[PDB]
Design an enzyme around this catalytic site. Structure first.
Site, PDB file in Angstrom:
ATOM      1  N   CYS A  26       0.831  -1.205   0.000  1.00 14.19           N
ATOM      2  CA  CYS A  26       0.000   0.000   0.000  1.00 14.19           C
ATOM      3  C   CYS A  26       0.866   1.256   0.000  1.00 14.19           C
ATOM      4  CB  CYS A  26      -0.936   0.034   1.211  1.00 14.19           C
ATOM      5  SG  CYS A  26      -1.810   1.629   1.338  1.00 14.19           S
ATOM      6  N   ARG A  71       0.103   4.580   2.914  1.00 12.60           N
ATOM      7  CA  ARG A  71       0.125   4.335   4.355  1.00 12.60           C
ATOM      8  C   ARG A  71       0.507   5.555   5.181  1.00 12.60           C
ATOM      9  NH1 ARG A  71       3.922  -0.636   4.754  1.00 12.60           N
ATOM     10  NH2 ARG A  71       4.432   0.076   2.627  1.00 12.60           N
ATOM     11  N   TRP A 121      -8.948   6.639  -0.572  1.00 12.35           N
ATOM     12  CA  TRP A 121      -9.241   7.360  -1.801  1.00 12.35           C
ATOM     13  C   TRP A 121      -8.274   6.862  -2.865  1.00 12.35           C
ATOM     14  CZ3 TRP A 121      -8.110  10.119   2.733  1.00 12.35           C
ATOM     15  CH2 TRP A 121      -6.766  10.463   2.895  1.00 12.35           C
ATOM     16  N   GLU A 139      -4.502   3.992 -10.555  1.00  9.57           N
ATOM     17  CA  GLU A 139      -5.327   2.799 -10.391  1.00  9.57           C
ATOM     18  C   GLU A 139      -6.457   2.784 -11.410  1.00  9.57           C
ATOM     19  OE1 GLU A 139      -5.998   1.511  -6.067  1.00  9.57           O
ATOM     20  OE2 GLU A 139      -5.519   3.664  -5.838  1.00  9.57           O
TER      21      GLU A 139
HETATM   22  C1  HEM Z   1      -6.019   6.696   2.052  1.00 12.12           C
HETATM   23  C2  HEM Z   1      -5.799   6.565   0.744  1.00 12.12           C
HETATM   24  C3  HEM Z   1      -5.150   5.283   0.176  1.00 12.12           C
HETATM   25  C4  HEM Z   1      -4.451   5.242  -0.964  1.00 12.12           C
HETATM   26  C5  HEM Z   1      -4.129   6.441  -1.889  1.00 12.12           C
HETATM   27  C6  HEM Z   1      -4.019   3.876  -1.144  1.00 12.12           C
HETATM   28  C7  HEM Z   1      -3.266   3.421  -2.191  1.00 12.12           C
HETATM   29  C8  HEM Z   1      -3.140   2.102  -2.526  1.00 12.12           C
HETATM   30  C9  HEM Z   1      -2.745   1.596  -3.825  1.00 12.12           C
HETATM   31  C10 HEM Z   1      -2.398   2.428  -5.089  1.00 12.12           C
HETATM   32  C11 HEM Z   1      -2.726   0.274  -3.744  1.00 12.12           C
HETATM   33  C12 HEM Z   1      -2.396  -0.676  -4.903  1.00 12.12           C
HETATM   34  C13 HEM Z   1      -3.783  -1.180  -5.314  1.00 12.12           C
HETATM   35  C14 HEM Z   1      -3.659  -2.034  -6.544  1.00 12.12           C
HETATM   36  O1  HEM Z   1      -2.667  -1.857  -7.302  1.00 12.12           O
HETATM   37  O2  HEM Z   1      -4.545  -2.893  -6.763  1.00 12.12           O
HETATM   38  C15 HEM Z   1      -3.111  -0.119  -2.399  1.00 12.12           C
HETATM   39  C16 HEM Z   1      -3.194  -1.398  -1.916  1.00 12.12           C
HETATM   40  C17 HEM Z   1      -3.567  -1.718  -0.620  1.00 12.12           C
HETATM   41  N1  HEM Z   1      -4.118  -0.874   0.299  1.00 12.12           N
HETATM   42 FE1  HEM Z   1      -3.896   1.137   0.315  1.00 12.12          FE
HETATM   43  N2  HEM Z   1      -4.503   3.101  -0.090  1.00 12.12           N
HETATM   44  C18 HEM Z   1      -5.222   3.945   0.748  1.00 12.12           C
HETATM   45  C19 HEM Z   1      -5.880   3.571   1.907  1.00 12.12           C
HETATM   46  C20 HEM Z   1      -5.879   2.318   2.458  1.00 12.12           C
HETATM   47  C21 HEM Z   1      -6.588   1.892   3.660  1.00 12.12           C
HETATM   48  C22 HEM Z   1      -7.477   2.875   4.445  1.00 12.12           C
HETATM   49  C23 HEM Z   1      -6.332   0.582   3.857  1.00 12.12           C
HETATM   50  C24 HEM Z   1      -6.758  -0.396   4.964  1.00 12.12           C
HETATM   51  C25 HEM Z   1      -7.126   0.019   6.183  1.00 12.12           C
HETATM   52  C26 HEM Z   1      -5.427   0.152   2.793  1.00 12.12           C
HETATM   53  C27 HEM Z   1      -4.905  -1.109   2.631  1.00 12.12           C
HETATM   54  C28 HEM Z   1      -4.328  -1.589   1.474  1.00 12.12           C
HETATM   55  C29 HEM Z   1      -3.869  -2.932   1.259  1.00 12.12           C
HETATM   56  C30 HEM Z   1      -3.908  -4.045   2.312  1.00 12.12           C
HETATM   57  C31 HEM Z   1      -3.407  -3.000   0.003  1.00 12.12           C
HETATM   58  C32 HEM Z   1      -2.734  -4.201  -0.708  1.00 12.12           C
HETATM   59  C33 HEM Z   1      -3.773  -5.165  -1.236  1.00 12.12           C
HETATM   60  C34 HEM Z   1      -3.002  -6.337  -1.780  1.00 12.12           C
HETATM   61  O3  HEM Z   1      -1.993  -6.816  -1.156  1.00 12.12           O
HETATM   62  O4  HEM Z   1      -3.432  -6.790  -2.869  1.00 12.12           O
HETATM   63  N3  HEM Z   1      -5.182   1.230   1.973  1.00 12.12           N
HETATM   64  N4  HEM Z   1      -3.334   1.034  -1.675  1.00 12.12           N
HETATM   65  C1  LIG Z   2      -8.073   1.312   0.464  1.00 13.22           C
HETATM   66  C2  LIG Z   2      -7.654   1.382  -0.985  1.00 13.22           C
HETATM   67  C3  LIG Z   2      -7.242   2.576  -1.565  1.00 13.22           C
HETATM   68  C4  LIG Z   2      -6.887   2.594  -2.918  1.00 13.22           C
HETATM   69  N1  LIG Z   2      -6.479   3.739  -3.518  1.00 13.22           N
HETATM   70  N2  LIG Z   2      -6.945   1.446  -3.635  1.00 13.22           N
HETATM   71  C5  LIG Z   2      -7.323   0.275  -3.071  1.00 13.22           C
HETATM   72  C6  LIG Z   2      -7.379  -0.971  -3.871  1.00 13.22           C
HETATM   73  C7  LIG Z   2      -6.684  -2.118  -3.498  1.00 13.22           C
HETATM   74  C8  LIG Z   2      -6.772  -3.253  -4.302  1.00 13.22           C
HETATM   75  C9  LIG Z   2      -6.033  -4.522  -3.957  1.00 13.22           C
HETATM   76  N3  LIG Z   2      -6.880  -5.643  -4.370  1.00 13.22           N
HETATM   77  C10 LIG Z   2      -6.636  -6.819  -3.515  1.00 13.22           C
HETATM   78  C11 LIG Z   2      -6.274  -7.590  -4.772  1.00 13.22           C
HETATM   79  F1  LIG Z   2      -5.042  -8.052  -4.793  1.00 13.22           F
HETATM   80  F2  LIG Z   2      -7.197  -8.506  -5.041  1.00 13.22           F
HETATM   81  C12 LIG Z   2      -6.404  -6.325  -5.595  1.00 13.22           C
HETATM   82  C13 LIG Z   2      -7.561  -3.228  -5.442  1.00 13.22           C
HETATM   83  C14 LIG Z   2      -8.245  -2.079  -5.799  1.00 13.22           C
HETATM   84  F3  LIG Z   2      -9.007  -2.038  -6.901  1.00 13.22           F
HETATM   85  C15 LIG Z   2      -8.147  -0.958  -5.010  1.00 13.22           C
HETATM   86  F4  LIG Z   2      -8.825   0.149  -5.347  1.00 13.22           F
HETATM   87  C16 LIG Z   2      -7.688   0.225  -1.737  1.00 13.22           C
END
Ligand code: HEM
Ligand SMILES: Cc1cc(N)nc(-c2cc(CN3CC(F)(F)C3)cc(F)c2F)c1
Ligand SMILES: C[C@H](O)[C@H](O)[C@H]1CNc2nc(N)[nH]c(=O)c2N1
Ligand SMILES: [Zn+2]
Length: 415
Positions: free
Chosen positions: A113, A116, A285, A290
């Site tokens: 993420c 963070r 957000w 994305e």
């Molecule tokens: C506040 C604005 C946030 C932004 C801009 C952000 C940004 C991102 C982005 C760009 C990704 C990659 C998603 C993808 O490529 O599919 C991601 C993944 C992720 N986000 Fe964040 N996020 C935010 C908030 C949060 C919150 C509030 C949580 C949980 C409490 C969170 C937990 C995660 C997790 C666990 C992943 C990885 C999912 C995975 O391993 O597939 N995010 N985030």
């Molecule tokens: C809290 C938050 C903020 C943000 N900016 N993006 C995401 C976000 C995360 C994932 C990860 N997903 C689990 C998977 F591996 F299956 C793909 C997928 C999305 F489409 C998202 F939009 C979440």
């Protein structure tokens, strides 16, 4: 055993000692690196009573360490309290404070993420009293409305009852609370989002009435206490959508593209002191890419490079004209401009990656490290003109954590 990460754009070095507190495994070995395997055998989630107390004690020890009452009497009694409850019920229940802490630190530890920097600004909705799919629907609607906040988006998570036996699992079957439907066509092609083509059909098998278009918001499939899941339509006034225009190309509006403001992952599992929360939708957000790079331009998604390049009148015969690249920049200028022109919270890939380097600095100072997954942290376009490209990042698994989990329809003993 006190490892160094370098930034090669700034020559800044940071020392990582936090990786010592790591517990889980990564998939790599001394002789093979799995850092680009998407769902490594480790990143996916029955657990017994013996395993539970080390996980509880470990978690409780860091929680009380965080409120600067480590090992006090209030700590040792909570250690005794949870031991005794894992005797009695072979499980236990988190305090509200413990739940908010665990949740924030699952985000904090989420190495993929990039957002963070915001990890301590998290609203936690305790839904652990929920019993029905209608109950979940209600909780999820309150979540949407709160997290959306009229476009001034707010981060939030809603935590449904923890797994117990494993056959009474609360699950949001949607991968994300708000997603567009995927319809395959009678001529083989695909309308809407090809990612959700299976899920879209599952909803119709449970009774959904599809308005077979592009950006049809999917209904919710909510499974309560292991019971067969049930369909619910999110009140449309609660689903905030942004029409995508460009600040230059007025034919961009005729592309007729739009996206939802709220990114809200619903299919992951939250782990807190060994307790498993199979339904824990969380939202923040969007970072622009994305939607503008992955959602709009993956070959397996909307795949709009084709028709965007057309309307730009581009050299489309030659691969080396970089017509794909040029069209992809315009697409993400449009996504950004549209969200901002509507006061809907969004962040560009430059601002977000800069904040993450700032976040890394804070984690390496007041925490000794920051788990980070370079493969996922670097944006999917313009990689090296963002500062995270040049930043060495140690990936390692800390807890509390968000984990993947099988899609519920592969695992749900049905009826
Ligand atoms: C506040 C604005 C946030 C932004 C801009 C952000 C940004 C991102 C982005 C760009 C990704 C990659 C998603 C993808 O490529 O599919 C991601 C993944 C992720 N986000 Fe964040 N996020 C935010 C908030 C949060 C919150 C509030 C949580 C949980 C409490 C969170 C937990 C995660 C997790 C666990 C992943 C990885 C999912 C995975 O391993 O597939 N995010 N985030
Ligand atoms: C809290 C938050 C903020 C943000 N900016 N993006 C995401 C976000 C995360 C994932 C990860 N997903 C689990 C998977 F591996 F299956 C793909 C997928 C999305 F489409 C998202 F939009 C979440
Ligand atoms: C093969 C690779 O692991 C896979 O495509 C990953 C690459 N990095 C990614 N990075 C982010 N942020 N999101 C993704 O979906 C992916 N996909
Ligand atoms: Zn590796």
């Amino acid at each position: 055993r006190f490892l160094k990460v370098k930034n090669w754009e700034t020559d800044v070095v940071l020392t990582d000692t936090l990786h010592l507190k790591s517990t889980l495994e990564t998939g790599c070995t001394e002789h093979i690196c799995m850092g680009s395997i998407m769902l490594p055998s480790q990143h996916t989630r029955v657990a017994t009573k013996d395993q539970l107390f080390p996980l509880a004690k470990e978690f409780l020890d860091q929680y009380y360490s965080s409120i600067k009452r480590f090992g006090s009497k209030a700590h040792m009694d909570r250690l005794e309290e949870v031991n005794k409850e894992i005797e009695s019920t072979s499980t236990y229940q988190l305090k509200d404070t413990e739940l908010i802490y665990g949740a924030k630190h699952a985000w904090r530890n989420a190495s993929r993420c990039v957002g963070r920097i915001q990890w301590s600004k998290l609203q936690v909705f305790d839904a652990r009293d929920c019993t029905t799919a209608h109950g979940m629907f209600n909780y999820i609607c309150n979540h949407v409305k709160y997290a959306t906040n009229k476009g001034n988006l707010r981060s939030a998570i809603t935590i449904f009852p923890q797994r117990t036996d494993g056959k009474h699992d609360f699950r949001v079957w949607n991968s994300q609370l708000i997603r567009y439907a995927g319809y395959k066509q009678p001529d083989g092609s695909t309308l809407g989002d090809p990612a959700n083509v299976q899920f879209t059909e599952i909803c119709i098998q449970q009774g959904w009435k599809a308005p077979r278009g592009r950006f049809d918001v999917l209904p919710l499939l909510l499974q309560a206490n292991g019971n067969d899941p049930e369909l619910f339509q999110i009140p449309p006034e609660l689903v905030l959508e942004v029409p995508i225009r460009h600040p230059k190309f007025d034919w961009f509006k005729d592309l007729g593209l739009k996206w939802y403001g709220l990114p809200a992952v619903s299919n992951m599992l939250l782990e807190i002191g060994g307790l498993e929360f199979s339904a824990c939708p969380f939202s923040g957000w969007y970072m622009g890419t994305e939607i503008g790079v992955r959602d709009y331009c993956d070959n397996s998604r909307y795949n709009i490079l084709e028709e965007v390049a057309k309307k730009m009148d581009l050299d489309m015969r030659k691969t080396s004209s970089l017509w794909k690249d040029q069209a992809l920049v315009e697409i993400n200028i449009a996504v950004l401009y549209s969200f901002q022109s509507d006061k809907v919270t969004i962040v560009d890939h430059h601002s977000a990656t800069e904040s993450f380097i700032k976040h890394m600095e804070n984690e390496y100072r007041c925490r000794g490290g920051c788990p980070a997954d370079w493969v996922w942290i670097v944006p999917p376009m313009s990689g090296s003109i963002t500062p995270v490209f040049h930043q060495e990042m140690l990936n390692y698994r800390l807890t509390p954590s968000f984990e993947y989990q099988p899609d519920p329809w592969n695992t749900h003993v049905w009826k």
